[PDB]
Design a protein around this ligand. Structure first.
Ligand SMILES: CNc1cc(N2CCC3(CC2)CN(c2ccc(CN4CCC(C)(C)CC4)cc2)CC(=O)N3C)ncn1
Lengths: 235, 202
């Protein structure tokens, strides 16, 4: 399929697409009401975000996303992620496909995680048959998964979004939610368009906020402190 | 000499200086991932000590990685003097073109791409960084990679490390401990081999 692409159809164009539904129902029953907060994260003391999070999804705006305010990996690496991650907790970091695949591993280690998974968003161009340093045409992005402390594949196939559309596939949320890692879930650099039950979203472009640390923590005070997000809510 | 050449040996102990410079290096090391061990692994220091740096002055390295070798192979890649500029992934499928790490099921294998020096006269941009191809034997890499490497750097000298017999290819010198003897055809190589190994024992 590589000589074929050399037709314009990326080889991934030709990839051809029982419970697991109860789990989705339990996740949805468990999900806290969406909460969200506009914040200029460059200038915002992360430490106001409490309690410590079980899952952090981190989707900073890389310059490469805008081919046609961008964060550099310098900026990203100064974020004090470790100050808000729970002792056992997980991170999912969108790294793009350039230097981010190396610099994001530095971030992971800098903040205390080890990588257990590399999740690839493979982008088809079925509807539409370069970086200087690039050798090959880049048709995918990576989302690095990190652990600290003690059903799905590592692939996501969708069609390349239109130029300037920066959204990531909503399937990242499904993968995360199916791990059952905790209910304290934080999405940094989310948007109005990504807000989602079971999640706290912080980002500079949100147009409304409803965050309240006390109200937020109240969702996890006993007897709900350790719920995975995948069980029957305690009655 | 365009036809296949190869060298059965332990790559730890072969004097790879006799082989000359290459425009492409490819390696599928038996990293010490996790544990298991259904084949002979090389320790991490053995991996960093490998004399990769003498094989190239300007060109590209292709480094298969898995598990914790995604980090280690990045280290070796940098220690040997390359910059990782791309990452090929191979989506492993079946005949119906459907898809075949304790947290997620693995649908892919990774190959880091490194550059060293100022390579010139290569056709960067012809292929894309995703390979979709069916799985052959265990620990078997897809032949699509050789096509991609040929289109990238056609006619140039290439060398594979830790190749297995099926991996012999025109333009390539395969090194691996499961190959049949020593098959060399390029005159400058046969010269420096006989100089360095007069009695044919590594
Ligand atoms: C001791 N020093 C040596 C060693 C050596 N080898 C190394 C071992 C060798 C034969 C040549 C290769 N090996 C192996 C197995 C698995 C992998 C992992 N890879 C698999 C395929 C992939 C592309 C999907 C990506 C991941 C890599 C190598 C299996 C095996 O049985 N053998 C005998 N040659 C010379 N000196």
């Amino acid at each position: 399929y590589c000589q074929h692409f050399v037709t314009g159809h990326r080889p991934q164009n030709f990839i051809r697409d029982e419970l697991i539904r109860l789990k989705d129902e339990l996740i949805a029953k468990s999900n806290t009401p969406p909460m969200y907060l506009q914040a200029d994260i460059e200038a915002f003391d992360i430490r106001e975000l409490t309690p410590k999070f079980d899952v952090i999804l981190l989707e900073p705006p890389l310059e490469e996303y805008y081919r046609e305010k961008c964060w550099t990996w310098d900026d990203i690496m100064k974020l004090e992620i470790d100050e808000i991650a729970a002792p056992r907790s997980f991170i999912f970091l969108w790294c793009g496909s350039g230097e981010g695949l190396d610099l994001g591993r530095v971030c992971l280690r800098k903040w205390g995680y080890r990588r257990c998974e590399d999740i690839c968003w493979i982008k088809t161009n079925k509807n539409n048959p370069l970086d200087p340093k690039a050798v090959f045409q880049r048709t995918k992005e990576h989302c690095l998964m990190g652990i600290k402390g003690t059903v799905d594949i590592d692939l996501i196939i969708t069609e390349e979004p239109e130029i300037g559309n920066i959204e990531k596939p909503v399937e990242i949320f499904h993968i995360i939610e199916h791990f059952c890692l905790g209910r304290r879930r934080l999405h940094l650099f989310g948007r109005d368009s990504t807000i989602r039950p079971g999640w706290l979203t912080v980002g500079p472009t949100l147009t409304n906020s409803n965050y309240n640390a006390e109200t937020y923590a109240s969702y996890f005070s006993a007897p709900n402190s350790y719920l995975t997000g995948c069980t029957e809510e305690i009655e | 000499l365009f036809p296949p050449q190869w060298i059965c040996c332990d790559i730890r102990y072969l004097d790879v200086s006799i082989l000359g410079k290459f425009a492409v290096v490819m390696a599928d090391p038996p990293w010490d991932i996790h544990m298991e061990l259904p084949y002979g692994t090389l320790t991490d220091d053995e991996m960093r000590r490998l004399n990769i740096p003498v094989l190239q002055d300007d060109g590209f390295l292709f480094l298969w990685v898995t598990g914790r070798a995604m980090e280690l192979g990045r280290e070796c890649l940098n220690l040997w003097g390359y910059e990782r500029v791309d990452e090929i992934i191979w989506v492993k499928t079946n005949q119906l073109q459907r898809i075949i790490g304790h947290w997620l099921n693995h649908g892919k294998e990774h190959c880091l791409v490194g550059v060293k020096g100022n390579p010139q006269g290569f056709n960067q941009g012809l292929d894309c960084d995703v390979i979709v191809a069916e799985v052959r034997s265990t620990s078997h890499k897809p032949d699509e990679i050789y096509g991609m490497i040929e289109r990238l750097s056609p006619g140039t000298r290439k060398i594979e490390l830790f190749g297995r017999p099926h991996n012999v290819q025109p333009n390539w010198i395969t090194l691996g401990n499961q190959l049949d003897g020593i098959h060399l055809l390029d005159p400058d190589v046969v010269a420096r081999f006989k100089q360095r190994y007069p009695d044919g024992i590594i």
